[PDB]
């Protein structure tokens with residue numbers, strides 16, 4: 001009701017009333033209950049993901065700042081890891097969303113003294129973050145169905 | 147009480163509707179009036195104790211000194227209405243009323259409680275035994291109703307088990323349970339230990355060794371109760387008492403310190419987000435905080451120091467609280483191996499058992515059974531194995547002086563030395579300390595805490611090492627621990643899946659190095675080519691690095707083959723790489739994780755369902771018991787409660803051997819011999835007396 | 841449990857729930873021990889009425 | 890499917906005699922009955 005009254009003020013608030021399909025339909029309610037069943041576990045999986053990304057951000061801030069320029073123009077560099085907060089935001093935002101991880105979004109290390117360190121960095125980010133934790137989320141949902 | 151004990155002994159071995167029990171009931175009927183008088187005495191004083199605590203009674207109290215007059219006491223009694231006029235007069239007579247007619251109801255109530263408790267307990271035991279062995283007798287229910295208050299009062303303290311006796315028949319045993327023992331059992335840590343033990347024995351436990359495992363659990367829990375009691379709270383000596391107080395406070399608050407350390411780690415890592423790097427001071431880079439206040443850096447320093455301090459306190463708390471159990475168990479298993487297996491006497495460790503080699507050191511040490519109770523195991527081993535293996539050999543192995551042995555029994559020697567620091571140092575047993583410290587360093591939790599501390603110290607050198615302390619959320623939180631355990635469950639399988647992936651990529655790299663080098667140029671500038679497969683190592687690195695990470699595989703990252711003589715070969719190459727590597731093996735990883743979730747879930751379900759369907763002791767199913775209403779839970783709370791079995795062992799240990807009954811002596815001897823036949827298996831009192839009971 | 845304290849002394853306590861005499865039952869059961877006047881004060885009861 | 894196959898084999902062998910097919914409950918009526926049965930009475934190694 002409050003959202004309807006707010007819709008009278010701005011009609012786009014009437015969209016929230018479409019979420020009632022969950023309560024109306026038993027099937028959607030069951031599907032959502034599958035998610036809610038292990039919701040606390042999913043939340044803590046997300047927290048663990050954040051911790052892992054924070055550790056990776058710390059490593060990058062210490063050793064791999066040079067690779068985090070996202071500016072094509074040499075005159076105006078845009079460095080995403082000169083500050084720890086920016087580096088963390090960059091990781092959690094782009095690397096998690098990327099298929100191959102942060103290595104997909106940061107500058108190639110070929111012909112660099114830290115090339116092997118960074119390949120380990122990228123591949124470990126990819127497996128742990130992208131593969132395993134996400135896999136854990138799907139597995140939680142599947143186990144809820146069962 | 148002694149007379150009642152004689153009667154209870156007469157009832158040893160009694161069967162349902164036995165002649166001796168029926169004779170007892172007839173005698174009680176003959177003596178009804180006096181039995182009623184005794185029961186009324188007990189119940190009247192039991193009710194007085196609660197009434198005086200009742201605030202409604204306190205309303206009648208109008209004297210600052212806490213005394214109550216006889217008339218006001220009489221009015222309080224008639225208000226509560228439990229007592230009759232004659233009963234109130236009797237209580238008034240028993241009241242030590244002064245010339246002012248004023249009474250100390252506190253001492254009046256407390257006077258007869260302790261003296262009459264043992265007789266009350268034994269009367270309750272007698273009535274319970276008689277009722278359970280003559281279930282159908284109206285003359286007994288009258289006495290039981292009169293004894294109601296006694297039975298309700300002593301219910302938490304009346305322990306009840308079943309054993310297989312010498313008569314080849316199930317026998318019920320009644321004993322006393324102490325308040326302290328019950329409280330210690332109800333402490334949450336014992337509950338967690340119980341749950342863990344149940345899970346382990348039900349999921350990966352053998353039926354044959356179930357009872358041995360249960361007795362080991364009981365022993366360890368008793369030792370833990372001792373430790374908890376010791377650390378519980380109500381100039382060199384002053385220093386010593388302060389030391390023990392501080393250590394016990396640490397032991398009591400161990401977990402709080404761990405939570406606090408985690409909180410400090412989170413605070414430090416929240417602060418560390420504000421660091422920034424500049425070429426200039428606020429060719430060398432400088433890391434510095436970025437805040438307006440300027441108060442954060444000192445806060446970081448203080449939090450770091452306090453975090454390190456808390457890590458130290460956690461090390462000490464663990465060493466004081468948890469280590470004693472480790473040593474107790476290690477000593478116990480060693481002693482039982484020596485006595486019952488003859489490990490270092492006959493078999494000898496396989497030499498692949500590092501623990502078996504390490505345990506050699508402490509055998510000859512005087513302090514060997516320091517934490518484990520049995521101080522005479524060396525003597526037992528000698529008596530058992532000396533005739534065969536050589537008494538002098540056993541004594542040499544176990545650090546025993548045969549001549550000193552006999553004289554110690556012949557006559558007491560008490561060579562008290564004055565306390566001194568030097569004397570203490572000489573008393574130190576270096577070999578026992580070395581063995582112990584090896585055990586501790588091998589203990590995983592101690593290692594984790596030591597690493598925690600080392601990382602804190604390193605954080606003081608470079609504050610970014612404080613981030614590793616955030617990994618402790620796994621140990622702190624049960625949910626994350628379970629989630630991680632799902633991964634660890636099939637960890638070896640996952641590792642080998644990764645190795646297989648590497649092999650497949652190596653084969654693809656070999657094929658590319660042979661036939662498809664032209665396509666592996668990643669340089670847009672024709673003048674400077676960057677070829678990633680002119681060397682096999684570079685080609686392998688390229689594949690494992692980019693192709694695996696790519697969604698469509700290596701074909702996404704290498705040059706299109708359209709209009710080339712090897713176009714179809716390469717499309718097969720790329721598509722097969724994509725399906726095998728990207729789809730299947732990764733799918734295998736997800737499937738492993740999902741199967742781990744299901745496996746943990748069905749383990750928990752199976753434990754729950756076994757415990758709800760079977761008696762942990764006899765193994766009989768819930769259906770037989772539920773033939774009678776509420777039968778299974780009555781069985782698990784009264785007949786075959788495992789907590790009562792542990793209570794019985796504590797009671798046996800604390801009781802003198804001369805006072806043990808035949809049943810208690812039987813079970814005590816079987817405990818000493820480590821025979822578990824007294825535990826009922828596939829049989830119960832109900833099943834044995836089924837026809838008579840029904 | 842804290843919120844339910846309010847309605848104990850209210851006359852309309854068992855408005856929807858059928859048992860209108862529970863206050864009396866509680867008095868008869870617990871008054872001898874806990875104080876009849878105390879129970880009546882808690883449950884909004886007038887003993888004389 | 891592979892997991893529940895292994896579990897089923899384990900659980901059949903722990904609950905039944907491979908020879909007579911009688912369940913562990915009958916034997917456990919007597920203490921240690923099933924393992925006495927499978928080690929002494931109906932050991933398949935002894936049949937070989």
Ligand SMILES: Nc1ncnc2c1ncn2[C@@H]1O[C@H](COP(=O)(O)OP(=O)(O)OP(=O)(O)O)[C@@H](O)[C@H]1O
Nearest residue numbers: 337341757758760761762763782783786787788789
């Ligand atoms: N011999 C036995 N002794 C005790 N419990 C048994 C026994 N056999 C089976 N059980 C089952 O064990 C469970 C133990 O009950 P209890 O309430 O003490 O444990 P719980 O579920 O862990 O709860 P709590 O929070 O009270 O510790 C009961 O469900 C009972 O069905």
Ligand SMILES: Nc1ncnc2c1ncn2[C@@H]1O[C@H](COP(=O)(O)OP(=O)(O)OP(=O)(O)O)[C@@H](O)[C@H]1O
Nearest residue numbers: 902903904905906907908926927928931932933934
């Ligand atoms: N007739 C039978 N003969 C032998 N074992 C039987 C029989 N019926 C059931 N079993 C089960 O088969 C299992 C065989 O026991 P055994 O210890 O020989 O095998 P195992 O688990 O493969 O161990 P091991 O490492 O000793 O070979 C036991 O668990 C027993 O419960």
Ligand SMILES: CC(C)Cn1c(=O)n(C)c(=O)c2nc[nH]c21
Nearest residue numbers: 364365366367368369519799817
């Ligand atoms: C746990 C232990 C310290 C107590 N404890 C024990 O468990 N058992 C089995 C005994 O025989 C024994 N004898 C003394 N103390 C004993």
Ligand SMILES: [Ca+2]
Nearest residue numbers: 803804805806
């Ligand atoms: Ca005696």
Ligand SMILES: [Zn+2]
Nearest residue numbers: 761763764786
């Ligand atoms: Zn049982």
Ligand SMILES: [Zn+2]
Nearest residue numbers: 906908909931
């Ligand atoms: Zn058989």
